[PDB]
């Protein structure tokens, strides 16, 4: 049978999750049954249909009351409590919990879904501590299907970790800087506002904003042998939506630019097939916008210097795109169900 | 509803502020 | 002896508020003491120095320690507490607190300030009920000294009133409506998000958001003749400062474009000098910022139809012109503390 | 051409008017009696086939394959001839067979420019902006009944004219308009400088997307056009922010009838659904700009907006996409002439 | 005594290098005595006076009539011919000419300025052809006097070249990729509109536009050393002004990230003094408006892999900065007249 | 022009309305305010700026584009 699922923060990627199981879920194993979220139904129905990045949602019809959802005659029930230790998980059978409000991502903090009734928890982000992490197409196939706790990574991770995998399998990565070009974020503010971080309290749509990442230091957690091996930054610019990472590698095996496109076009064909694509058009941010992949290599990008420093360029709807995987992995987890 | 209560309770938090301009 | 103020709400407004007292600290009556808001001193003193709109601050240095903001040698003494109740304006001898947090509009919530030791307050928004309200060069010498709550209105109301006192007084308005082309403020999220207006949720600068606004009908608040005359709406744009007011006056006595530019300029050099300024230059809106007028009339604009329909067009820098009238309606109560 | 035969069509400008015309007629080209067959435009066909497929704001077009040779861009397997010559008078109208030109560069908008089409051998030619002198112009909806066929030159009016003259028909013959002022808080266009730079006006010389830009604009008085018992009854300005497509017009307008903004609604929707059926949609919904990306109306009322003071003072309010919504129109003027061609 | 200039192309850097000559008059061996441009001398003194960048001008009062600009007395006369050998550069007695059009960089190009009666034209962009190339700081006393045409390279080369410097005297670079995060000119388009560059060709404002940089090039031809030892590209982001480049070098010296920041600090204060500054700030794009440096070096975001492996972040005001460089230059060349 | 052109749309409503001897003095004498009119534009092609007549010859350059939004 279905594993019911409540989506626990209605916000970019909580929506952008709901969207692509309602544009997948012929073929799904998992039933989105309840949303937690600090609004109402009735402003998250909005929301839902009406988008500013993804326009109005078109495969399905989305009205709401005072109690549910309905997306397409299914109703969707909703709640509004923060501590999610009072979450009718055990009331509303829950099995999974697609933990996207990005203050639970401690194992202390993703169990109070556990003891609401839960029985595992997807983190749509890095988890802090010692919580399994997976990028699909990287590293799910060692997921442990008695893990109750698990994270997905961030969006720069799932974009850069493909990639990376690919390029250590070929040349042997022995270092490596990485720099996304990124997106804002609604957690940066509007106009200049406090903030814990000195320069995400800038105007986001006003400056470019230099940030830091866990995310090249994280590829290390679902590539074990690169462990250590890649640093790297991010810049904040005035783009609502789609990103890209920009990768310098040093590579034990010498090589051209016209090889490592080849060896990465030929993933893109095969293992990497869904996660990686290969572009070699001279397109802009907004192409990518709904692209279904991790990483979008831009080929006539790359670029190799003295054989072993290499520069590969890369896109991704890093709401989009990283949403399909977060999809991925829970219909992988529903799987293996234990 | 649990939104507005919670606008209640946080009048300044980023889903409940309205600057009359 | 100097009358003492408290800025509660370090933001857009407290914050500009703070920069323009600190250019006009020789010739003041005023002596800013203390400050309270969600935020410690040192990163309050980060986002005063360096703002994305003024700049960094050139006049005077800037620092912090745990305890206090230093500008010019003038220690800030600093406090972070939400409920004013706790405050301690009896203990630093506060009179006058400026209410910019936008949250304690009302009579109700702005009294606490008294309560805790404060003896007046300033509000830097419209009010709730009873509160009076004040536009400096329209109705701020009615202030009576013994009223130990205000309103300073709003930007729009601010840059519309001057424009309505001057078009009443020559030609007698008898229905007016207003559009403020609005730079997004503070209020409206940076992407889509829960929000309890569901246009204010939606991404500010990806969009053209319409609001309503109290701003038109508040122009009755202090030009008593026209109490539901006038009406009005307002369309957020993608800027992050400097509006501009769109007003469409039924008119009494027939005129044309030549004679209601006369008359404002006319009034801009004599009776509103310092609050109208005329122009006849073809500027846009970047070049208003830092203007200290509440309102700049756009005299190339100015047309008229059948000799009753007037349409004005008026710019104003919303963050530091509104902040400028702030601290004159400040200094004209310490003239008139009593 | 015979009835059965398609009405043979040539783009002049293939910029955003031009592509976004071409596909509109691609989506509909399934019932139409225009067949797109030639392209003129100072680019060359690659370059073309590359922007009319990767739009920033359509999106990737979806529908049919978009290819290119030296010659020809192609849209489906269909063959779109071009060529690249600033001057009308040179172009191969004759030899491809051309009935109608759609003039979309913006700078052939007399009746003495656009007969350069005439003269290369293009039978009619329908200008998507205001035309200059008495060139006989036409708003969908409004009058494009009034249309005669010994026309050979016409124009569709501008993207705010076609939002503003349907809303102001239907308040007209509801209330009777006497005077009305209009703002237009619009996207910017091509016409301004994207940074500071040389410009006949000094304020589409300033930076478009970080600047509120007045401009003046002749759609107002243009409705009088279209609605000749309202001539010199109508002004108003415009003001370009930094937003890349959707406009929206604000219309304040001193009637006769004494009336409150219920029943200014409730006019404007009983229109949306009759004589006004495609042209104005009615909205009571709490949208943005963003969410009237690829609305097929040429104005969306929002009736939160509206409000009405002592009776005779009514504001209202309505979006249009000014570069999907106007194409929308020039296409239904378009197939409206084929329909009437002799 | 003094040199006499004139500027071609009246822009963004021809109005920026203005308002620089115009605050360093009172010590300058140039005199701004000519214009040529596309618009008409009233157009140009409004555009040099308010600037949406750099805000109104205000040292000096600026006018204009049929025939010159007046900046604060000091005429400059004005022409309107897109043809340089029509420049009337005899009858003006022209010794230098700044050739700030982007459409004269090449050696023929450039030459129609000395058959109109030029003795030197200093373009400010990469030069085609072997133009001798500068760069302020880096190689600019290799000037040599005899050379009619020169290049002050591109805004990228002058902010990466004094750090390639540095960092290659200190630890031998042996390969390095650039990508700078660039603000948008007015080589890009407003909306889709047809250019040479399918990417450029993009609605400016709404993407991420990789392109190329011309520092790619450039910084080779400043360092002959790493002549073919350097690459990278431009990503074009929704910002008017101010840009930072990311420098990743494959370095022989092994080193960590604090020295690295050393080598850059004690430059910046000795022998790079007024070419690198050395920022350990959390500023953002914003704060570095006006900047006078060509580099200024984030140093928070150094980080190093391995010993080899540096990564290094810069900014600079693209128009403001390079027009200080090209002031330079042209001083410089006063200087060494012949 | 703002006089001229509103004298010659009155002068050739004062044509239409005596026709409506008179009526030839009444069109001789619109058409010295249109031979005037043509005195005065052609004088503005005189002293028109080099940018001016950039415009003419490039209307479609991006310093010359007005779309009547
Ligand atoms: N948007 C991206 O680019 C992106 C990409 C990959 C990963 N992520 C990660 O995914 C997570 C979601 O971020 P987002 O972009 O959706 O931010 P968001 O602010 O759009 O979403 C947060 C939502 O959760 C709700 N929420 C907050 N606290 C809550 C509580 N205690 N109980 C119930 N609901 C609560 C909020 O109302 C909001 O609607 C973040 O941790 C982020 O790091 C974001
Ligand atoms: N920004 C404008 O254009 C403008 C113009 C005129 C009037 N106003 C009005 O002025 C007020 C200030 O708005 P703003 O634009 O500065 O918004 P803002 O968010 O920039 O300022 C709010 C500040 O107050 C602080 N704050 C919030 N709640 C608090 C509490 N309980 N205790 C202490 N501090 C608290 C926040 O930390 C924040 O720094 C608003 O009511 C607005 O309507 C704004
Ligand atoms: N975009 C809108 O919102 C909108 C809406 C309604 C009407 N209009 C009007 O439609 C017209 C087109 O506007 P647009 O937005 O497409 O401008 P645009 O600059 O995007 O398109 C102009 C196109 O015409 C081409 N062109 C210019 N001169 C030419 C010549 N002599 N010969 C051949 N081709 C030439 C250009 O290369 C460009 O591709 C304008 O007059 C505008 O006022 C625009
Ligand atoms: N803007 C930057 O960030 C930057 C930085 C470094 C170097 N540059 C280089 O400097 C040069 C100037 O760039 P910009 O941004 O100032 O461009 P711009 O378009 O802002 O300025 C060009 C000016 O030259 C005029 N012009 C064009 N062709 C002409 C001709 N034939 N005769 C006379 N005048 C003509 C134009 O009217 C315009 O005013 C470019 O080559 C650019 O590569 C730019």
């Known amino acids: ?338 | 509803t649990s939104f507005q209560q919670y606008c209640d309770d946080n009048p300044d938090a980023a889903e409940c502020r309205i600057y009359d301009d």
Request: net charge negative; aromatic share 6%; with cysteine.
């Open chain 1, 1 to 338: 049978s279905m594993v019911r699922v409540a989506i626990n923060g209605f916000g970019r990627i909580g929506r952008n999750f709901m969207r692509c199981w309602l544009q997948r879920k012929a073929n799904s194993k998992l039933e989105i049954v309840g949303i937690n979220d600090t609004s109402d139904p009735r402003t998250n129905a909005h929301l839902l249909k009406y988008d500013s990045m993804l326009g109005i949602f078109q495969d399905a019809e989305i009205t709401a009351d005072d109690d549910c959802i309905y997306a397409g005659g299914h109703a969707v029930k909703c709640v509004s409590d923060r501590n999610p230790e009072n979450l009718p998980w055990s009331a509303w059978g829950i099995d999974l919990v697609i933990e996207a409000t990005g203050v639970f991502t401690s194992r202390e903090g993703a169990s109070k879904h556990l003891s609401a009734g839960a029985k595992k928890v997807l983190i749509t982000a890095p988890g802090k501590g010692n919580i399994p992490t997976y990028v699909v197409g990287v590293n799910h196939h060692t997921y442990d299907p008695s893990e109750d706790i698990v994270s997905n990574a961030s969006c720069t991770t799932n974009c850069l970790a493909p990639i990376v995998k690919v390029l250590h399998e070929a040349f042997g990565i022995q270092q490596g800087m990485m720099t996304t070009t990124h997106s804002y974020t609604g957690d940066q503010r509007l106009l200049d506002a406090s903030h814990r971080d000195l320069r995400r309290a800038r105007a986001a749509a006003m400056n470019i904003v230099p940030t830091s990442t866990g995310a090249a230091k994280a590829v290390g957690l679902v590539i074990p042998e690169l462990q250590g091996k890649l640093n790297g930054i991010a810049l904040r610019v005035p783009t609502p939506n789609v990103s890209v990472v920009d990768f310098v590698a040093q590579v034990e095996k010498p090589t051209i630019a016209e090889q490592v496109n080849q060896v990465i076009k030929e993933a893109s064909e095969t293992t990497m097939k869904g996660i990686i694509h290969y572009s070699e058009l001279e397109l802009v941010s907004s192409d990518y916008r709904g692209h279904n992949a991790s990483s979008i290599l831009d080929a006539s990008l790359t670029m190799v210097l003295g054989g072993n420093l290499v520069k590969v360029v890369a896109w991704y709807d890093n709401e989009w795109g990283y949403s399909q995987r977060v999809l991925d992995l829970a219909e992988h987890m529903a799987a293996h169900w234990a």
